[PDB]
Every structure is written in C-alpha cells, then in structure tokens.
Amino acid sequence: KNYARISCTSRYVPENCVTNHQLSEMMDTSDEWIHSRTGISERRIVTQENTSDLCHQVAKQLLEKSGKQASEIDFILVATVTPDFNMPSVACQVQGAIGATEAFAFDISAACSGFVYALSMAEKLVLSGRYQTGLVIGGETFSKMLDWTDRSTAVLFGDGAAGVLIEAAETPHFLNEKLQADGQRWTALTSGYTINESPFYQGHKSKTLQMEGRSIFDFAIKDVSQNILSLVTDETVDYLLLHQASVRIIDKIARKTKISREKFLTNMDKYGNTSAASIPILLDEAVENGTLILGSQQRVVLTGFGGGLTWGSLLLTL
Amino acid sequence: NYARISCTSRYVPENCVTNHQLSEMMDTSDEWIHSRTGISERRIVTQENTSDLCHQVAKQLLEKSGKQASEIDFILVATVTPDFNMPSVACQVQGAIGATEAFAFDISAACSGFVYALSMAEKLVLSGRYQTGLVIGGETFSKMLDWTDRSTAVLFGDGAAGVLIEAAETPHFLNEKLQADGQRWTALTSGYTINESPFYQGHKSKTLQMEGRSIFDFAIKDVSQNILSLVTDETVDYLLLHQASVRIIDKIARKTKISREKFLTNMDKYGNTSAASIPILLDEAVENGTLILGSQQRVVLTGFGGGLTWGSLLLTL
Ligand SMILES: CC(=O)SCCNC(=O)CCNC(=O)[C@H](O)C(C)(C)COP(=O)(O)OP(=O)(O)OC[C@H]1O[C@@H](n2cnc3c(N)ncnc32)[C@H](O)[C@@H]1OP(=O)(O)O
Numbered sequence: 188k189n190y191a192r193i194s195c196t197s198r199y200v201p202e203n204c205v206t207n208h209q210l211s212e213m214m215d216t217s218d219e220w221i222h223s224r225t226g227i228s229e230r231r232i233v234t235q236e237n238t239s240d241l242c243h244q245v246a247k248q249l250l251e252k253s254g255k256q257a258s259e260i261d262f263i264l265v266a267t268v269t270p271d272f273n274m275p276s277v278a279c280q281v282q283g284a285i286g287a288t289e290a291f292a293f294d295i296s297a298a299c300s301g302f303v304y305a306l307s308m309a310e311k312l313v314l315s316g317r318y319q320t321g322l323v324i325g326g327e328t329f330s331k332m333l334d335w336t337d338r339s340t341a342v343l344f345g346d347g348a349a350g351v352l353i354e355a356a357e358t359p360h361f362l363n364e365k366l367q368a369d370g371q372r373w374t375a376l377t378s379g380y381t382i383n384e385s386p387f388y389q390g391h392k393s394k395t396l397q398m399e400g401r402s403i404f405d406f407a408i409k410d411v412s413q414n415i416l417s418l419v420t421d422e423t424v425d426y427l428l429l430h431q432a433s434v435r436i437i438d439k440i441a442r443k444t445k446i447s448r449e450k451f452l453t454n455m456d457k458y459g460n461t462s463a464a465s466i467p468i469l470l471d472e473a474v475e476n477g478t479l480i481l482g483s484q485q486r487v488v489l490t491g492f493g494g495g496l497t498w499g500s501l502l503l504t505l
Numbered sequence: 506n507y508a509r510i511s512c513t514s515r516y517v518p519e520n521c522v523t524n525h526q527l528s529e530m531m532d533t534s535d536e537w538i539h540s541r542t543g544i545s546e547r548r549i550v551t552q553e554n555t556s557d558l559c560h561q562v563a564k565q566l567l568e569k570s571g572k573q574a575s576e577i578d579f580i581l582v583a584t585v586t587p588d589f590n591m592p593s594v595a596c597q598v599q600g601a602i603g604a605t606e607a608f609a610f611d612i613s614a615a616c617s618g619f620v621y622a623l624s625m626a627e628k629l630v631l632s633g634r635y636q637t638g639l640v641i642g643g644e645t646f647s648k649m650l651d652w653t654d655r656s657t658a659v660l661f662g663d664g665a666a667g668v669l670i671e672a673a674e675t676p677h678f679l680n681e682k683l684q685a686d687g688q689r690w691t692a693l694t695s696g697y698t699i700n701e702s703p704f705y706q707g708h709k710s711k712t713l714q715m716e717g718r719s720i721f722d723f724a725i726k727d728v729s730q731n732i733l734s735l736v737t738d739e740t741v742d743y744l745l746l747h748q749a750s751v752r753i754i755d756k757i758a759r760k761t762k763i764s765r766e767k768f769l770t771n772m773d774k775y776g777n778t779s780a781a782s783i784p785i786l787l788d789e790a791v792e793n794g795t796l797i798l799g800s801q802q803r804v805v806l807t808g809f810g811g812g813l814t815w816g817s818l819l820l821t822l
C-alpha cells in the first residue's frame with residue numbers, strides 16, 4: 188500500500204475581487220486587451236492576508252472536509268515563490284497554524300511548476316512507505332511583487348492558494364511523469380531579487396517581477412506540447428489541467444498537441460495568473476463542478492511551466 | 506535503486522573575516538564570540554551570491570567524479586538566501602553547468618535544508634525514475650544580516666557544499682527522522698518581504714532576527730531526542746550536526762551520552778552557514794580522511810533551525 192492518490196481538494200482566494208476595468212483605471216490598459224490576450228477578466232488581490240494565511244485556509248479546509256485531524260498529517264509541502272519570509276517557510280507557518288505537530292514541512296521553489304513538482308515529490312515520499320499522509324499546497328501573493336505601473340505584468344498575476352490531501356492507497360494512481368527545466372533561460376521570468384548591501388560586498392549588481400513575454404509564450408507552446416505528448420495522446424487522456432497563464436497559450440497547445448480542446452480546462456478569466464496555485468485552484472473547482480470526480484479513474488494530466496525555466500506533467504488517475 | 510553519496514565537494518568565498526575584524530565594527534570581542542560558539546572566522550562574499558557558490562560546488566562534483574552534466578537527472582539546492590524568488594538557485598546552477606537533462610528546484614527548510622533535501626533525493630532515486638543527482642546546500646547570510654546587531658552579525662557566514670548522489674546495489678540510507686514545529690517559527694526569521702501594492706491595506710524588517718535562548722534550549726532538548734531515535738553511542742561512528750554553536754554540540758553529546766569525539770566540529774573556520782554547514786563539514790572530513798566513502802561507517806547527519814525544523818539521517822558512507 189505505497190500508492191499515493193489525491194483524496195480531497197480545496198482552494199482559497201482573497202475575498203477582494205479586481206476586474207480589468209478597475210485596472211484600466213490605473214494604467215494605460217483595457218478590459219478588451221487584457222481579456223483577448225489572456226482570457227483574464229478578474230483577479231483576487233489580498234488586502235491583509237499573505238501567502239501563509241491563504242495556505243493556512245486551504246490546509247484547514249482539507250482537514251475539515253476530510254475529517255482528518257492535523258495529528259494525522261505526516262508532512263506538508265508548499266509550492267510558492269512569494270513566501271512570507273526566507274525563513275520560516277510557508278509550510279512551517281502552516282504546520283504550526285493548524286497544529287500538525289507530527290508533520291515535517293518545507294516549501295519548494297519551482298515557480299509556476301511548483302505544484303506539479305511538489306506533487307510528484309509527495310508521491311515519492313508515500314511510495315517510500317515511510318509516509319502515508321500529507322498536504323501539497325500551491326499558494327501565491329504576487330500583488331506584493333508586482334510593479335503596478337508596468338502594465339506589461341501588473342495585469343497578469345493574481346493572489347491565491349489551493350491544495351490537495353494526499354494519502355497512500357493499494358491501487359496505483361500516479362501512472363507516469365516527466366519533469367523538466369532549462370536554467371539557460373532563467374532570465375525570461377524573474378522576481379524577488381534581494382541585493383547584497385553588506386559592508387563587505389563590493390560588486391555592483393529590482394525586487395519586482397519582470398518577464399520576457401514572447402520568450403515564455405514561444406517556449407510554452409513548443410517545449411510544453413512536447414512534454415505533454417511524452418505522456419499521452421488525445422486518445423489516452425480525459426482531461427488536462429495546465430498552468431493558467433494565458434488561454435491563447437492553451438489554445439495553441441491544444442492545437443499543436445492534437446488533443447480535443449474541451450479537455451483543457453480553463454480558469455484564468457476569474458483568477459488570472461496565480462502561478463503555483465493555478466492548477467490546484469482549477470482542480471478543486473473542477474471537482475466541485477463535478478467535471479472531475481475522485482474515484483472515477485479519469486485519466487488526467489497536470490502540467491505546469493514557467494520561472495526557471497521549469498515545466499513538467501503528471502499522468503495520474505483521479 | 507539504493508542511493509549512496511559518491512562524491513563530496515565544497516566552496517566558500519576567499520574573503521576571510523576574523524572575530525577581531527568584527528570586534529572592530531561592533532561592541533564584541535573574539536573572546537566572547539569564540540567562547541560561546543567556537544567560531545573564530547567566517548567567509549563573506551564580496552562579489553558572489555548563493556548561485557555562484559553553488560555553481561562551483563556542482564562544477565567540482567563533476568570534475569572530481571568525471572561525470573558529464575548531461576548525466577545529471579536532477580538538482581536540489583537547499584538555501585534560504587537565494588538570488589531571486591525565481592529563478593531558483595537550482596535552475597541557475599542547472600543552466601550554469603549545462604545540465605540540460607536534469608530538472609531542479611530549491612528546498613526551503615532553513616538549517617535543516619540539507620538533511621531534508623538529501624532525504625528527498627533518496628526517495629527520488631528509490632523511485633527508480635532517477636539515478637543521478639546533485640544535492641547542494643548553499644547560503645549567503647552576509648546580505649541578510651544587520652551588521653550593527655552584534656546579536657546575530659557574529660554568527661553567520663557564507664558558503665556552499667554538496668554531494669553527488671547515485672543509485673547503488675546496496676542500501677546506504679538506513680533510517681531517518683524529519684521533524685518540524687511551526688509554532689515557534691518566530692524564533693528565527695529572515696527575508697520578510699512586505700506587500701506595498703496599492704490594494705494592500707494591512708499594517709504588518711528584511712534582515713535576520715532570532716531568539717537566542719529559545720533555539721538554544723530547543724536544540725539541546727528536541728535534537729538530542731531526535732538523534733537517539735536513530736542511534737545510540739554504540740550504533741554510530743560519527744555525527745555531523747548543524748554547525749551553529751559548539752556549546753550546543755557539547756550539551757547534546759552529553760545528554761545524548763554519545764562519545765563527544767564523534768561530533769565533528771567546524772564552526773571555528775566558517776561560523777553558522779545554515780544549510781551549507783553540514784556538507785562543508787562532510788567534504789572537509791572526507792578530505793581529511795576522517796570519513797571515507799565505501800568504508801561503511803555509521804554516520805548520522807542532523808540539522809536544526811528555522812521553522813522550526815530538524816531531522817537526522819542514519820546512513821552508511
Ligand atoms: C509563464 C506565465 O506564467 S505567463 C505566460 C506568458 N504570457 C504572456 O504571453 C502574457 C500575456 N500575453 C501577451 O503579452 C501577448 O499575447 C504577447 C506575448 C504576444 C506579446 O508579445 P510581444 O511580441 O513582446 O508584444 P506585441 O508585439 O504582441 O505587442 C504587445 C503590445 O501590448 C502592450 N501591452 C503590454 N501590456 C499591456 C496591457 N496590459 N494593456 C494594453 N497594452 C499592453 C505592449 O507594450 C505592446 O504595445 P506596442 O504594440 O505599442 O509595442
């Protein structure tokens with residue numbers, strides 16, 4: 188019984204809702220541009236909460252919903268790139284917050300691929316027979332990294348968190364995976380640069396997020412379609428939950444990929460780019476709508492891509 | 506499908522800073538610093554960041570091992586002083602050495618990051634899906650510190666070290682115990698980035714801060730218990746703990762009842778390098794011949810700190 192499975196999903200986003208119209212009133216941008224370019228119509232931006240609070244809520248919900256108590260959690264992995272501190276890790280904040288005294292935790296830094304990466308990591312942990320229960324949460328608060336005057340990026344990212352309760356099963360669910368990265372293009376998407384100002388530093392080396400639009404666009408369409416076809420073919424997949432960066436991107440991938448577009452579930456119109464939280468939000472939401480149903484054995488693939496560059500897919504049966 | 510450390514390597518900035526140079530900057534003395542931590546000097550970057558330090562460690566693991574970057578299946582960097590939120594130091598290192606065939610990411614577990622990260626690699630290899638990887642612990646606290654607060658400025662140093670890990674026919678990672686206590690996360694914290702967006706209304710310090718006695722008392726009590734979970738004086742040959750304070754290692758060796766000469770020390774030359782402390786000590790011990798790969802010595806690696814996090818790994822070198 189070393190086979191992991193997702194057995195409970197949950198999401199949480201700031202109550203605050205910001206539409207493209209409220210943004211067009213802040214920068215030289217419009218609802219028609221933003222939307223026709225990404226499919227994004229609104230986003231949720233924190234006003235008080237940070238990444239740890241958002242994740243805290245997801246964890247809380249997983250337990251309430253699953254009837255599982257914190258003492259049962261063996262571990263906690265948070266995939267974030269907008270953590271509260273360098274230390275502690277959001278995972279540790281969350282651990283102490285829900286009183287999961289028996290679990291150990293840490294965050295994983297893999298940008299917009301953080302959830303797929305983190306999730307895979309958990310499967311390895313459970314498969315080891317060492318651990319059976321854990322929480323994999325993807326949470327982000329980009330609002331605090333963005334330059335709200337650079338319309339280039341300010342209109343894309345949103346705040347949010349979502350995760351799943353993962354436990355060992357007797358039957359295998361995580362069929363196959365392919366995690367990839369290309370650090371020779373790391374410059375394409377970057378944020379959080381902390382400069383050294385110690386009295387010893389003598390080098391002459393921007394804390395806000397900055398990215399190369401085309402670079403990542405072109406990259407995703409190519410490198411991702413390849414990574415997805417590695418695992419499946421339209422004929423061998425039921426649904427695909429990709430990073431919700433741009434609908435135009437998903438549209439181009441579905442085409443190159445030769446996979447029925449109806450399988451690529453979309454969410455960005457309501458949350459925008461939440462990076463590592465995009466996929467789990469979409470997943471919980473799909474479960475809720477009934478599109479996906481745990482136990483149904485539906486062949487689903489989860490694929491993320493972004494900062495790193497990083498990207499990877501997971502073929503699993505829900 | 507059994508992992509085994511097969512090559513170690515370290516790298517620290519050339520810039521050596523002694524307790525005397527610091528006593529000159531703050532109200533502190535070499536006498537105080539040393540007698541409370543055993544630290545005599547640190548390594549402080551002058552033009553290097555975490556990625557640069559880790560890059561060398563990786564570079565060297567390949568040289569030493571004769572492996573080609575194309576052979577690396579993955580890269581895990583345990584850091585808490587990364588260059589950027591994104592990319593991850595791991596990704597920068599990946600592109601830096603041209604390890605096109607590996608995927609990578611950083612793990613955020615403070616001073617336990619190496620033991621945590623290392624364990625992680627174990628599972629990856631055990632999964633049979635990956636058989637080669639680099640686990641590096643790197644840090645550059647000098648940029649996080651408030652060099653006027655003698656409370657913390659005298660403890661941390663910069664540095665990086667790691668190991669080349671590959672699958673073997675025989676098991677090496679015998680047993681492990683990873684723990685955390687997020688209810689005392691406040692004890693040691695750094696890098697708080699404040700939200701300054703036009704929407705944020707909340708009214709919630711970028712530099713490192715920590716509660717001395719909290720962590721001291723915590724380490725001595727909780728770590729000793731953790732270590733005894735895996736071994737006893739007779740079932741262990743060497744122990745490589747986080748190199749925070751020698752006085753801490755002393756108190757632990759006592760309560761633990763394990764021969765003190767089994768706890769290898771290193772802080773005198775590097776200070777607290779957090780996630781890099783253990784691998785630097787390990788590469789140093791291997792170089793010195795105290796430890797010898799293949800020898801099959803009972804070794805336990807234990808880290809503790811920010812989180813709170815802590816955990817040990819019982820493995821045979
Ligand atoms: C991995 C992630 O998580 S995000 C994925 C990457 N996603 C994206 O591509 C972001 C969303 N999409 C876009 O930016 C477009 O579809 C892109 C990528 C084709 C633009 O690429 P580029 O070749 O560099 O720009 P393009 O030639 O199409 O022109 C874009 C124009 O829009 C402007 N622009 C940028 N943001 C906005 C905005 N919010 N509102 C109005 N105009 C904007 C540009 O400054 C530029 O104006 P110009 O025509 O006067 O130079």
Ligand SMILES: CC(=O)SCCNC(=O)CCNC(=O)[C@H](O)C(C)(C)COP(=O)(O)OP(=O)(O)OC[C@H]1O[C@@H](n2cnc3c(N)ncnc32)[C@H](O)[C@@H]1OP(=O)(O)O
Nearest residue numbers: 532533534537616655656659717718720721749750809810
């Ligand atoms: C997990 C890790 O990575 S770190 C592990 C934790 N490490 C350690 O505990 C650090 C080493 N230990 C210590 O400094 C002490 O022995 C401890 C454990 C008793 C805790 O220290 P503190 O709680 O800060 O106060 P302590 O009881 O030692 O008092 C010493 C006094 O000297 C000051 N002080 C601190 N550093 C120095 C220094 N380098 N030179 C002179 N005075 C100093 C203190 O702030 C205090 O005086 P003040 O209260 O008037 O400012």
